[PDB]
Symmetry: D2
Subunit: 277 residues, 4 copies
C-alpha cells in the first residue's frame, strides 16, 4: 500500500513530460511485426535488435568523444569516456541471454518474413567497426541504396581510427612512433607494425614512468576483448537458432561470423605479450 506524496506535479498538459522528452509516441510506434497472423516471438526479435541499435548509437557518441579527448592530450577524460564505452559494450554482450530463450522451431515461424534483412546491413555497427579501425571498403557496396550513410562511412574511412589516434598521441609524448602515423592513406586498414613492439615493451616495463600510456593500452585491450565477446555470443546464438544455415543476408552465416572473430583491432598491443618482461 504506497500513498501518493504531496507535491507531485499532476497537471502536466502544457508542460514537458517523460514521454514527451523521450519522444515515446514515435519510439514505441516503431515495432511493426510483419507475421500474418501474429507470432508471439516476433516482438522479441524486434526489441532485441532495436535496443542494440540504441546502444550502438550511444557507443558511437562516446567513441567520437574519446577521440576528441585523445587529440587534445586529455587522458583522464578519455579514459572516463572509455569506461562508459566498455559498460555499453557490456550491456550489448549481456542482452544475448534474452534471445537464448528463442528456440529454432519458434524462429521458423517468422524467419521467412524477414526476407534478405540482416544486421550485416547495420550502418551504425559498420561505423563502429570502421572507427575501431577494421576498415573494409568492400563494405561500402552494401550501402549503395544509401548515399548519406555511405557518405558518413566514407568520412570515418578517411580519418584516423581510434588506435591510430592513440599512436599519434604516443608520438606527441616522445615515443618512437614512425612519421607515417602523422599522415598517410587512412582508408587502408592498419597493418601490423613490428617497429611498435619496442615502444609498447617500454610502456609496460616502466609503468611508473608511463602510467598514462599503460592505462590507455589496458583500456584499448579491454575494448577489444569486450567487442570480441559481443561477436562470440552473437555467433553462439546463431549456432543455436539457425545452426549452420546460410544467413538471411546471403552469407555462409557461422563461418562468415567466425572470420571477424579471427581478426584483431589493436595487433601490436596483443603481440607485445610474447616479449614483454
Amino acid at each position: 500500500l504506497r500513498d501518493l506524496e504531496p507535491g507531485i506535479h499532476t497537471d502536466l498538459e502544457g508542460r514537458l513530460t517523460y514521454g514527451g522528452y523521450l519522444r515515446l509516441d514515435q519510439l514505441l510506434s516503431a515495432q511493426q511485426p510483419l507475421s500474418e497472423p501474429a507470432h508471439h516471438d516476433e516482438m522479441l526479435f524486434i526489441i532485441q535488435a532495436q535496443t542494440s541499435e540504441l546502444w550502438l548509437k550511444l557507443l558511437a557518441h562516446e567513441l567520437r568523444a574519446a577521440i576528441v579527448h585523445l587529440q587534445r592530450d586529455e587522458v583522464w577524460q578519455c579514459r572516463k569516456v572509455l569506461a562508459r564505452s566498455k559498460q555499453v559494450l557490456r550491456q550489448l554482450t549481456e542482452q544475448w541471454s534474452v534471445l537464448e530463450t528463442l528456440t529454432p522451431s519458434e524462429y521458423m515461424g517468422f524467419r521467412d518474413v524477414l526476407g534478405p534483412s540482416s544486421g550485416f546491413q547495420s550502418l551504425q555497427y559498420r561505423y563502429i567497426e570502421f572507427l575501431l579501425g577494421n576498415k573494409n571498403p568492400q563494405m561500402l557496396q552494401v550501402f549503395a541504396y544509401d548515399p548519406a550513410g555511405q557518405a558518413r562511412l566514407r568520412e570515418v574511412l578517411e580519418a584516423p581510427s581510434l588506435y591510430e589516434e592513440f599512436l599519434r598521441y604516443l608520438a606527441r609524448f616522445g615515443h618512437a612512433i614512425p612519421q607515417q602515423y602523422q599522415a598517410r592513406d587512412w582508408t587502408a586498414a592498419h597493418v601490423a607494425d613490428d617497429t611498435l613492439r619496442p615502444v609498447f615493451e617500454r610502456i609496460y616495463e616502466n609503468t611508473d614512468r608511463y602510467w598514462r600510456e599503460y592505462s590507455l593500452c589496458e583500456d584499448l585491450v579491454d575494448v577489444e576483448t569486450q567487442f570480441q565477446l559481443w561477436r562470440f555470443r552473437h555467433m553462439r546464438t546463431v549456432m543455436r537458432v539457425i545452426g549452420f544455415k546460410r544467413g538471411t543476408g546471403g552469407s555462409s552465416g557461422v563461418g562468415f561470423l567466425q572470420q571477424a572473430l579471427a581478426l584483431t583491432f589493436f595487433p601490436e598491443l596483443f603481440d607485445v605479450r610474447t616479449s614483454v618482461g
Copy 2:
C-alpha cells in the same frame, strides 16, 4: 581483413531492408536532447531510459502471454514465458551499470532542461506494476493529462493480476482457495490472506505431487526478487546522482522510492517461509 563472401545480397532497393523492418529512421530520430550548448551526457541519459522503455514494452507483451497460458492451464508454456520475462528484468537491472558513470556535476549541466519530467510518468512501468498486482488508483490521477493511457491503465486495473491468475489456476486444481478469487473487485489491490498459508505449505512439502504449482511458486518469487533489485539499483543510482534532493517529478525522491521497495507483490509466498517444513 575479411573478404566479402560471394552470396551476399547487396541490392535491396525493392526488398524488405534491415532498416525498414526495424523502422530505424523513426527509432533513431527519437533522440532530441534539449541542452544549449549541447551536453555530452544528455544522450546517455535519453538512451538509458529509451532502452528501458523498449524492455518494459517487451516485458508487458510476455507478461500478457504468461496470463493467457495460466488461464488455459498451459504450465510448461507459462514457465517458458516467465523465463524470458526474468531475463528482460535481468537486463533492465544490469543496465544501471552504465548510468553509474554519470557523476552529479555532469548531471547538473542538463537536469534543468527536463523540467518536471520523471519515470514516475512512465505509462509502461505502471502498466506492469498494476499487472503484477500493485494497483494504486491514485496513479490514474497522475495520468489525467493523457486520457488514452489513463484508459489503458483502467483496463488492467480492472482485470485479475498475474498473482490472482495464479490463484485461479490453483483453484482449478483442487487446492483450497477462497471463492473471492473467482470474482471480486479486481481494482482493490490484493490484501494478504492467511488462509493461503496452508495451501502453499502443502505445495512446498509435497513437491513430487505439486511440482507444477511448486515450480510456478518459485517463478513468481524469482520475478518479485528481480523487480526488487531493479528498484534497489535505480534507488542506489538516485543516491549517487542526486543524493536526497527532491525529484524532478515533485516527490521527495529516495524516501518516496524507498516506500515502493517496502511493498511486496506476492505476500503469501514470502509469508509461507515462516512455517514451511520439510519436503515429504
Copy 3:
C-alpha cells in the same frame, strides 16, 4: 551506527560456529604463494583458480544428480538440477572479469615460480569434460603422478556421459534411438536427425524432451563461453607464448572451442 540486538548469540566459546562448520582454518590456510619477495598479484592468481575449483566441485555434484534423476525418468527434478548447474557455469564465466585486471608485466613477476603447473592438469575440470561427453583417454597420462585421482578419472571415462543418458531416456519413451565402451567419444549420428526433428516439431507432445534438449544446448553454450573467456584472458596475459603445461597456448585452447559436446542438437537446426 548499528546496535547489537539482545538475543544474538555472542558466547560461542564452545559451540558450532560459521568458521568451524565451513572449516575456514583449513580453507583459509590453503593459499601458499611462492614469490620471494611476495608479489602482490600472486594472491589474485591463487584465489581465482581456487574459487573456480570449488565451483567445479559443486558442478560435478550437481551433474551426477542430474544423471541419477535422468536414469529415473525424473524430468522436473533433472531440469531443476540443470538450472543450478547453469548458474554455477555462469559464475565460472563471470569471474574472468577479475583476472582481466592482471597485466602481462604483472604476471612476468611470478609466472616462473609456477614451474610446469597448468589447469590442463585440473582433475575437476577434466572430470566435467568427461561427464559432458568429451572423453579423451590420453588425458589419464597427465595424472599418473596421482593414481587415486587418475583412477577416479578413469571411472568417469567408462560410464555413459550426461548426453548418453538423455538418449537412453529418450529410448524408454518410444523415441527411435539406435539399439547401439563409453571411454570413446560419442560419434555423431545422422539417424538421430529425425528423432530431434520430431521433438522440435511437436512441442506439445514432446514438451519434456524439448525442454531438456534446450537445457543441454544452454549448458554447452555456457561451457563454450567459459572456454572463450579463459582463452581471451590467455591472449591478454601471455599472448601467444607457449603454455606452462608445455602446450602451444591459445592454439591448443582453440582446438577445444571447435569441439561439440552434443553434435546432433546443433545439427538439427538445419532441418527443423
Copy 4:
C-alpha cells in the same frame, strides 16, 4: 610442481564436510557458496590494504588500479547470489538444524572489511571471544584509519581544507558525519579539471559503497526467499537486523554533497 599441489587442492577440496545424516543433496551448494565468498573476501582484504598503502604514498593511479580489481571482486560476490536462489525453503529445512547457532555474522573476514571501510562497531569483538587471536586481528583494524580516513588524510597533504582531527585520533570509533567536509567536496566536483585525481577517487569510493550495498541487499533478498521473516541461526531478528546495516552509510559526506553541487 603441479596445479593441484601449487593450489593446495588436497586441503582445499577436503574442507567440505556436510553434517546432515543421511546427507542432504543441497548441503554442498550451501557450503560451497559461503566458502567461495570467504575466498573472495580474503582477496578483497588483500587488495583494500594495498590500496590504503598506495594512498599513504600519494600513489593515486596505483590506488585506482587496485580499487578497480576490488570492485570486480565485490562484483563476483554480488553476482553469486544467483546460484543460492535455486535453494527453496523446504530444501533448506532439510539441513537448517545441523547448523546450530552458526551464522555469517561470525565471518571474521566480512567483519575485517566492514571495519576497513569504516563501519567500526566495538560491540562486534565479543562475537569472537572464542577465537582470541582472530579477535586481536580485528582489534588491529579497529585501531587503524579506515580507507575513508586515509583518503581524507590524502586530501590534507594536497592542500584541501581537511580538519586537524583527521591527522591522528581514536580510530576505534566509526567516523561521524562532518559538515565541514562539504565545501571540500564541492570544490573537487566543481573543478574536475583541477582535481581530476581527487574527483576520480571520490567516485571510486562511491562505486565501492554502492556495490557493497548491493551485496547486502541481494543477501537480504535471499534470506527472504529462503527463511523469510524467521529469526536467524545467529540469534538476530534476521531481515530486520540486516535492513539496519543497509541504512548505514560508509562515506556520508560523499553522498551528502550531491545536495549542493552545481
